mmCIF file of N, CA and C in Angstrom:
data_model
loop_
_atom_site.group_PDB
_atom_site.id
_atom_site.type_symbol
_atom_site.label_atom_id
_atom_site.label_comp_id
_atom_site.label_asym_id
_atom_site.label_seq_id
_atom_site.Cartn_x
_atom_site.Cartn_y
_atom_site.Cartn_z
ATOM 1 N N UNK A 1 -81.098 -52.381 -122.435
ATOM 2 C CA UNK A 1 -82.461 -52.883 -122.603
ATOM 3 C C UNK A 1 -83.005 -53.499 -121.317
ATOM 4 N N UNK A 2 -81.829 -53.560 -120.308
ATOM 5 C CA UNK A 2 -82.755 -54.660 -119.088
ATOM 6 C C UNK A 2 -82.903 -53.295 -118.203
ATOM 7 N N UNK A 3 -81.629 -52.512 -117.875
ATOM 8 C CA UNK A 3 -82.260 -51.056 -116.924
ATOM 9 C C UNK A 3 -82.877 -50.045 -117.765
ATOM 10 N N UNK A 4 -83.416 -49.840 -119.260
ATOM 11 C CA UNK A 4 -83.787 -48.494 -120.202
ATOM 12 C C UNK A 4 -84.546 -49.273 -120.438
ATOM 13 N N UNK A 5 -85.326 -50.557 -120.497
ATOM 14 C CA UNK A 5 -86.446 -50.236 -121.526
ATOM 15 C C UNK A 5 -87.276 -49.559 -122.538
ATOM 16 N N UNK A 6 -86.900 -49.489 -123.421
ATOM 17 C CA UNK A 6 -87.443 -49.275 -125.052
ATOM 18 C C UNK A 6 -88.038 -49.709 -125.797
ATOM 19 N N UNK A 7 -87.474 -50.493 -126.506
ATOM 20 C CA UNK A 7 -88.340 -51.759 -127.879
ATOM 21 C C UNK A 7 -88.308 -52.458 -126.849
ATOM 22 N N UNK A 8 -89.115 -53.629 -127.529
ATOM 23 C CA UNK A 8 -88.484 -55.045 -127.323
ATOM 24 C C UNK A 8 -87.552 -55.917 -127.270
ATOM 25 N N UNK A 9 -87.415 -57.060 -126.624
ATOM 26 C CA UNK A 9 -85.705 -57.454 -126.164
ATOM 27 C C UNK A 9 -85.879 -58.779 -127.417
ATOM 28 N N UNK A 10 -86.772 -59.043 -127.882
ATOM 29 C CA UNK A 10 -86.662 -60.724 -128.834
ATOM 30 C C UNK A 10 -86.173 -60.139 -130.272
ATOM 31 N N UNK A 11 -85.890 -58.799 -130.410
ATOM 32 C CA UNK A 11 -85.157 -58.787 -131.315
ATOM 33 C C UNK A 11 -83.671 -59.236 -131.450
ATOM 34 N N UNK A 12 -82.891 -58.909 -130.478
ATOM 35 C CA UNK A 12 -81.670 -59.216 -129.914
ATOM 36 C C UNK A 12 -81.915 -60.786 -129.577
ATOM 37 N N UNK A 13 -82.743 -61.428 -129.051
ATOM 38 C CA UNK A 13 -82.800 -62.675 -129.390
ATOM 39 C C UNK A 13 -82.992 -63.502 -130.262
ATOM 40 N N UNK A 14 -83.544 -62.803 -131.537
ATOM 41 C CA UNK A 14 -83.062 -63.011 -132.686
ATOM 42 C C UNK A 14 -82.550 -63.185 -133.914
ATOM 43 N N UNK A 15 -81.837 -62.022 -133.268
ATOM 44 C CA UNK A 15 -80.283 -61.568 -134.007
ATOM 45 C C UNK A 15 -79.557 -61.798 -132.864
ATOM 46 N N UNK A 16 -78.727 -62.639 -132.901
ATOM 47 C CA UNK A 16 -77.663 -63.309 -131.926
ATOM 48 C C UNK A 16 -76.309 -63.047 -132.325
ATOM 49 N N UNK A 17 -75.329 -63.174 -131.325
ATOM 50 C CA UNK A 17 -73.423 -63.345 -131.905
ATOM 51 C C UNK A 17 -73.445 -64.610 -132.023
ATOM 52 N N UNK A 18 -74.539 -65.753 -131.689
ATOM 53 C CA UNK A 18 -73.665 -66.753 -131.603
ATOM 54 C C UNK A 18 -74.327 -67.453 -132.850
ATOM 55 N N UNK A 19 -74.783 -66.719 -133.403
ATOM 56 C CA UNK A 19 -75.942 -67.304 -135.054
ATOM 57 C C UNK A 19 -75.039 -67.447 -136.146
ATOM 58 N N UNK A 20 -74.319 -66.340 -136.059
ATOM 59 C CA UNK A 20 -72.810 -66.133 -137.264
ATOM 60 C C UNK A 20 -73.505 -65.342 -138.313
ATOM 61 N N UNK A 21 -75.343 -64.625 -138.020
ATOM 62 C CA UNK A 21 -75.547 -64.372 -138.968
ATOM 63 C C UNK A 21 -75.396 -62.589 -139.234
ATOM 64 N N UNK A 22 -74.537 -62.397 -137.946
ATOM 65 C CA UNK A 22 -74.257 -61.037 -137.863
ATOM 66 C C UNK A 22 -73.157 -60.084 -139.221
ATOM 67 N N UNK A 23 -73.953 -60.417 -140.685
ATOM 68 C CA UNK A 23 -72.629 -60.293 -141.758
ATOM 69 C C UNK A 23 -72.376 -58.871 -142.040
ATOM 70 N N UNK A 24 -73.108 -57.868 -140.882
ATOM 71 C CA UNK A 24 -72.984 -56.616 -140.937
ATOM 72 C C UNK A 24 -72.684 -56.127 -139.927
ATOM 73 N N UNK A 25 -71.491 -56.060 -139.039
ATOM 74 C CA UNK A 25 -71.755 -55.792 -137.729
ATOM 75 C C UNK A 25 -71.762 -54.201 -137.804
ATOM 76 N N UNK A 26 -71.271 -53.442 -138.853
ATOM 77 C CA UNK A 26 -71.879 -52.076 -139.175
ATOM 78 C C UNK A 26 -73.173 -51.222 -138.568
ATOM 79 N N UNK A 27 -74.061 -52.450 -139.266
ATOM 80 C CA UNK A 27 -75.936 -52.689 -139.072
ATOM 81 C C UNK A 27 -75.635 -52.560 -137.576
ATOM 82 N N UNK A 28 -74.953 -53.599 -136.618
ATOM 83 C CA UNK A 28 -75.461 -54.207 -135.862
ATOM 84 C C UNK A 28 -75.049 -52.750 -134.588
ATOM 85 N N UNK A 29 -74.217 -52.286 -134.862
ATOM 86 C CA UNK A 29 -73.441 -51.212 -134.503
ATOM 87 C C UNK A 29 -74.356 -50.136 -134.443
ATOM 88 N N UNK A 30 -75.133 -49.777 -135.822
ATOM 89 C CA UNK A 30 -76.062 -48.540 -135.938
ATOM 90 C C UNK A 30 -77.223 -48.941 -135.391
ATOM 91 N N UNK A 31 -77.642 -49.855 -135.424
ATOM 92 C CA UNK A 31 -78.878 -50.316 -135.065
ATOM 93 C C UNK A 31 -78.504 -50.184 -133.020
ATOM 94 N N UNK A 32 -77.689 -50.385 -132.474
ATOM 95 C CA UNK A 32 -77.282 -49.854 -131.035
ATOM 96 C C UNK A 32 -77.402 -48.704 -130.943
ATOM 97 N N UNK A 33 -76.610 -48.057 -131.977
ATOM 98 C CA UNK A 33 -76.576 -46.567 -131.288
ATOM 99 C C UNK A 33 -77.548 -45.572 -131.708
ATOM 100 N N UNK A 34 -78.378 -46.288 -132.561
ATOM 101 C CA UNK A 34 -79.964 -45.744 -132.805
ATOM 102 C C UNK A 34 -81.108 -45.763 -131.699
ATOM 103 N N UNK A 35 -80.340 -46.852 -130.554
ATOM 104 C CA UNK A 35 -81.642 -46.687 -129.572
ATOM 105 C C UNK A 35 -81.418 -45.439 -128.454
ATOM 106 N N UNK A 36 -79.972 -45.257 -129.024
ATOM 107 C CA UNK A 36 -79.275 -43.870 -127.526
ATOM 108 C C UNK A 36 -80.110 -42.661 -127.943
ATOM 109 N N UNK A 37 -80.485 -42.123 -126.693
ATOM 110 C CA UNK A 37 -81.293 -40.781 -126.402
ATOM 111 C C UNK A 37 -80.274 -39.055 -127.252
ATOM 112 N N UNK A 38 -79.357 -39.909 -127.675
ATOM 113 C CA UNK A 38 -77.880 -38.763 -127.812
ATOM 114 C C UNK A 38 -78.784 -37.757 -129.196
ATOM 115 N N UNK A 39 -78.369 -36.771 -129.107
ATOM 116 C CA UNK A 39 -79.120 -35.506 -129.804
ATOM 117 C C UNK A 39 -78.563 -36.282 -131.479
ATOM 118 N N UNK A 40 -79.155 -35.735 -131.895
ATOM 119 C CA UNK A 40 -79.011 -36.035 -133.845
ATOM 120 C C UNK A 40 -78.003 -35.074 -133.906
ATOM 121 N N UNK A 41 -77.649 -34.017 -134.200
ATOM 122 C CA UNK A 41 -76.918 -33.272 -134.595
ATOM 123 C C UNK A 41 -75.103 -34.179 -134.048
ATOM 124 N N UNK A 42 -74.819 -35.079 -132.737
ATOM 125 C CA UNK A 42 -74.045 -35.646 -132.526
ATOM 126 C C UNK A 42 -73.869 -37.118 -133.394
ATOM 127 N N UNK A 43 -74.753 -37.444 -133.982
ATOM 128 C CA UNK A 43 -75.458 -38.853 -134.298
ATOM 129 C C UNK A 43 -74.569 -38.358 -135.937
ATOM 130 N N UNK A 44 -75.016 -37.545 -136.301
ATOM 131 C CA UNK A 44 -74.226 -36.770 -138.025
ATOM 132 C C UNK A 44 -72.675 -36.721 -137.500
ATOM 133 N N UNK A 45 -72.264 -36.477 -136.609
ATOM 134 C CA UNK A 45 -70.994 -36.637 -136.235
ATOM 135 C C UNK A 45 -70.589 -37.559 -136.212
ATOM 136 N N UNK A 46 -70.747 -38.643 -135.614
ATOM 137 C CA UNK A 46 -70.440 -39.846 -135.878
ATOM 138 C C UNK A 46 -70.211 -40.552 -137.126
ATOM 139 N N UNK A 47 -71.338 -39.777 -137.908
ATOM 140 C CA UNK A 47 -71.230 -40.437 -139.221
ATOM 141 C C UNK A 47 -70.053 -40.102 -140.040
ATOM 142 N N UNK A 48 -69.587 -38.796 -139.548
ATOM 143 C CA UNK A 48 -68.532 -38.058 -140.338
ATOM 144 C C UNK A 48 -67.249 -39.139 -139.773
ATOM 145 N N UNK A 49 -66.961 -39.380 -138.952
ATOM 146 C CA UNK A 49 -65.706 -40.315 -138.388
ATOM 147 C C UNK A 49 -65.260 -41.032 -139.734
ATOM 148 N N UNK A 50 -64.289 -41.578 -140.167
ATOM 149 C CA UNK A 50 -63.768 -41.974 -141.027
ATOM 150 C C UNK A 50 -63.462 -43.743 -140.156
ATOM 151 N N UNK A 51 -62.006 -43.438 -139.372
ATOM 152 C CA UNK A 51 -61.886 -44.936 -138.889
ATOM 153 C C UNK A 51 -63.417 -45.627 -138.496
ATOM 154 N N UNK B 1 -76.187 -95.422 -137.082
ATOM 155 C CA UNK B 1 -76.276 -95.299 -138.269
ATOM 156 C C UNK B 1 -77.768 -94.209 -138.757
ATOM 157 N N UNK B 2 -77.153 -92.575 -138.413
ATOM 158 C CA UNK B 2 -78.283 -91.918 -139.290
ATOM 159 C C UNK B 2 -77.656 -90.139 -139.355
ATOM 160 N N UNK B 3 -78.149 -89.443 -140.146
ATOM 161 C CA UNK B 3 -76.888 -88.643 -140.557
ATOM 162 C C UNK B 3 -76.862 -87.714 -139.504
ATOM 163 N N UNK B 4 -75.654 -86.612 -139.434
ATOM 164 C CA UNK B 4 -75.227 -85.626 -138.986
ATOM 165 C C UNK B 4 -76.313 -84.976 -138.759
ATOM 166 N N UNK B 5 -76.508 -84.025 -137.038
ATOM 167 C CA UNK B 5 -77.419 -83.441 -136.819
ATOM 168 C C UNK B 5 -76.982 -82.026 -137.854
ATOM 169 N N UNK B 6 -77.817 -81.317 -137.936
ATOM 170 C CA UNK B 6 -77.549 -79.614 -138.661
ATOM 171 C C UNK B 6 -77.187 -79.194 -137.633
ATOM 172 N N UNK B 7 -76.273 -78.588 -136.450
ATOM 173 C CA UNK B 7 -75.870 -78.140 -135.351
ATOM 174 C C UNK B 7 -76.349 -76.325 -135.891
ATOM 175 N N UNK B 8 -75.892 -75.826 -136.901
ATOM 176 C CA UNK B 8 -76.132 -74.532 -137.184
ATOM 177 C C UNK B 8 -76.251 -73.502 -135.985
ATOM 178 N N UNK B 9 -74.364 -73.204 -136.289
ATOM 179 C CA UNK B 9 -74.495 -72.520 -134.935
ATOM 180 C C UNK B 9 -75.174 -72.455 -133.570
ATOM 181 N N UNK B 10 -74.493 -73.809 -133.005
ATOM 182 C CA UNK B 10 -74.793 -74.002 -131.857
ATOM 183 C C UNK B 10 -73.983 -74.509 -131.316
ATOM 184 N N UNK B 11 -73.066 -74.613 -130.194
ATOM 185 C CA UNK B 11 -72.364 -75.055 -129.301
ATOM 186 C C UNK B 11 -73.053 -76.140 -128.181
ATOM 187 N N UNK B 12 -72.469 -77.167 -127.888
ATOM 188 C CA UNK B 12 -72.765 -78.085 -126.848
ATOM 189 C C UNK B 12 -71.762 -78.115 -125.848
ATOM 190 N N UNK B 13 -71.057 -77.775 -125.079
ATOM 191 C CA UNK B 13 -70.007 -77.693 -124.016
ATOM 192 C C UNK B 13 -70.261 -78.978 -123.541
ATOM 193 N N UNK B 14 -69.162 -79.914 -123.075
ATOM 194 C CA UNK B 14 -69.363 -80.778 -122.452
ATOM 195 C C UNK B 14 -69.957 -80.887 -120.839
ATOM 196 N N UNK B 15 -71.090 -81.589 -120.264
ATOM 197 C CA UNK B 15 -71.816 -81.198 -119.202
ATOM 198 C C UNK B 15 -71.948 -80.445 -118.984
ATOM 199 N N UNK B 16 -72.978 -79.867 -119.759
ATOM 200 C CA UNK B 16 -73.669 -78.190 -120.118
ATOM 201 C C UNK B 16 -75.300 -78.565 -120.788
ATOM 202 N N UNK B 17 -75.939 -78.275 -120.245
ATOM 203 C CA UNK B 17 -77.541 -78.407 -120.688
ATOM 204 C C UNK B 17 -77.324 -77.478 -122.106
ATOM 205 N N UNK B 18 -77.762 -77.802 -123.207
ATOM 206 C CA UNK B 18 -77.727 -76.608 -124.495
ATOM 207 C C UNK B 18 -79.325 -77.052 -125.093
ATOM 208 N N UNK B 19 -79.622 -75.558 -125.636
ATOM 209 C CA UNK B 19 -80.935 -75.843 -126.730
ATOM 210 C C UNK B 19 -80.226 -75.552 -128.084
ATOM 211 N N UNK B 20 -81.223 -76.032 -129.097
ATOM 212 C CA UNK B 20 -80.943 -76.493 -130.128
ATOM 213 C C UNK B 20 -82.204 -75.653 -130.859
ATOM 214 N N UNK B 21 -82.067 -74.834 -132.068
ATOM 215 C CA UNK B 21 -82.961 -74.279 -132.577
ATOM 216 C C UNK B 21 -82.471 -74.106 -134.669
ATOM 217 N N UNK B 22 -82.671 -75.361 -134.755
ATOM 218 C CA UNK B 22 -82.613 -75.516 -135.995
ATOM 219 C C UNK B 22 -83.692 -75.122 -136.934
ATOM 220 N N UNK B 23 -83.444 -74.660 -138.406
ATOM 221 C CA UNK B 23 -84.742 -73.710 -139.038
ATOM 222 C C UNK B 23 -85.477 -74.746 -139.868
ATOM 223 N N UNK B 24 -84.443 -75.744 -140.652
ATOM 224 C CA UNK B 24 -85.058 -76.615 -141.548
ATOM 225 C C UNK B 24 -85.605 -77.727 -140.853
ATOM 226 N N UNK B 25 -87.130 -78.343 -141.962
ATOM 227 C CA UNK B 25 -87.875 -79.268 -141.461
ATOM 228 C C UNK B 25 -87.643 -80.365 -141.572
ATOM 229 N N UNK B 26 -86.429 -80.460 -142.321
ATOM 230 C CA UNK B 26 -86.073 -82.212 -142.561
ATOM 231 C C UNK B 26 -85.555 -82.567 -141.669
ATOM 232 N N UNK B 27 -85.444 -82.144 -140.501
ATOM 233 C CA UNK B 27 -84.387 -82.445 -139.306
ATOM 234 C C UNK B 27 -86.217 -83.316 -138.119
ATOM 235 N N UNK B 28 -87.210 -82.743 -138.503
ATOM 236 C CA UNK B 28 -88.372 -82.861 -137.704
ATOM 237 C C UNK B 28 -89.098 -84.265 -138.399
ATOM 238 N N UNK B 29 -88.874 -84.345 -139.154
ATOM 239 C CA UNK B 29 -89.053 -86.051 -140.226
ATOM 240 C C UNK B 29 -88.220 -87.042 -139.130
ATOM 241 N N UNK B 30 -86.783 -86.783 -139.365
ATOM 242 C CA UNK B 30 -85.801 -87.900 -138.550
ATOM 243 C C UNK B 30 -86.235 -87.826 -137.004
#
């Protein structure tokens, strides 16, 4: 977010690690790799991963 | 003699400037 600019950064400021209110880090996980440019068809792959 | 701040997830390090961003208003009364 500081060299790619995309959204906005005050989201991440408020959703913090140090809030404790992170009770999904799942969310917090998809919600990252939702901002990557990476093709969808790889993005369904991921989803398939089990671990 | 007056109660416990709500710290709510926040750390103070000793000689360390920290902010404090508490949600509830009863803390803005005291």
């Amino acid at each position: 977010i500081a060299l790619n600019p995309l959204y906005r950064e005050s989201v991440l400021q408020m959703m913090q690690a140090g809030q404790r209110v992170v009770d999904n880090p799942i969310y917090l996980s998809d919600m990252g790799a939702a901002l990557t440019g990476a093709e969808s068809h790889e993005l369904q792959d991921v989803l398939e991963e089990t671990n | 003699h007056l109660p416990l701040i709500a710290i709510t997830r926040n750390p103070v390090f000793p000689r360390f400037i920290k902010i404090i961003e508490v949600k509830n208003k009863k803390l803005v009364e005291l």
